[PDB]
Design a protein around this ligand. Structure first.
Ligand SMILES: [Cl-]
Lengths: 173, 173
């Protein structure tokens, strides 16, 4: 029996700054004695940077992976070649595998994965620019969400980082 | 004999901006058919993000590591615990092992590693804030240098990223 009270796509508010989100997230994971790891592609390391700028980072976060290419996803995060060929790197399946691959490599408890098209170009399969797939691993369970962000590449990547954090907060309720 | 010209330590200039250095590095690495990987700590993923912002990132860069803790440095990049106990995480020996460890995990040709004190705190062994150790791996050979940047943490981190990139370029000439 699946309870769906927490399945809300968070709507980012101006109060959901990187600073405020990592404030809430850091103290929550420290309180829960949980260790976070991250895997990202299009955001390039900016999610990791958000967490490394948080307070008391070493008490909950150590390992961040940036895997910009198909080969890096396959080698570092054990994303399967078959899944990339079937679905492309910007896909629900690959995001989920990046989240479980980071868990494995880092020996962590919680993870966040981001893979998307920052823009101006979209996918060869027609996936429009601004589409970003996300995945989170929490308590042995995996979650995914897709978003379609408006604006240029700088604006899309900044929203993806904030969304990745804010939605983990939602899933931790 | 070792030639000082070819192995000189660079000095940052105002024209050495991130876009100009990554553009110069991208052309040079693609021309040489070499693959780059990075390992960073205090810079938090800003080095990787600078490389993922450059043009044709997939042709020369795939895998970036953020290892913010001792546990991450040991688990992800095979930094030895004894080197951490002996020299601390902000040291020449740990920087060098982060560079070689990244080469191995990524199966890359070239690597940069950064570990340091962005500030305001230094090391509790007297190592002042602003000290950053660097390592570069090229063609089997490892190079190191320590830097003492002035300014606040944001200023120190941006200087480190520029110097890491600038020095890689000169070693590649
Ligand atoms: Cl913000």
């Amino acid at each position: 029996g699946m309870n769906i009270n927490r399945n809300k796509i968070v709507q980012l508010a101006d109060t959901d700054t990187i600073e405020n989100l990592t404030s809430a997230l850091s103290q929550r994971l420290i309180a829960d004695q949980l260790r976070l790891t991250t895997a990202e592609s299009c955001t390039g390391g900016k999610l990791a940077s958000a967490l490394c700028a948080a307070e008391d980072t070493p008490k909950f976060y150590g390992a961040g992976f940036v895997t910009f290419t198909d080969q890096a996803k396959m080698k570092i995060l054990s994303v399967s070649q078959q899944s990339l060929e079937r679905y492309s790197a910007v896909s629900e399946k690959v995001a989920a595998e990046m989240a479980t691959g980071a868990i494995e490599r880092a020996d962590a408890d919680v993870s966040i994965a981001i893979t998307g098209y920052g823009g101006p170009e979209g996918g060869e399969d027609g996936t429009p620019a601004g589409t970003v797939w996300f995945a989170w691993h929490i308590k042995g369970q995996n979650y995914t969400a897709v978003m379609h962000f408006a604006g240029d590449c700088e604006t899309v990547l900044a929203l993806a980082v904030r969304f990745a954090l804010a939605q983990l907060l939602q899933l931790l309720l």
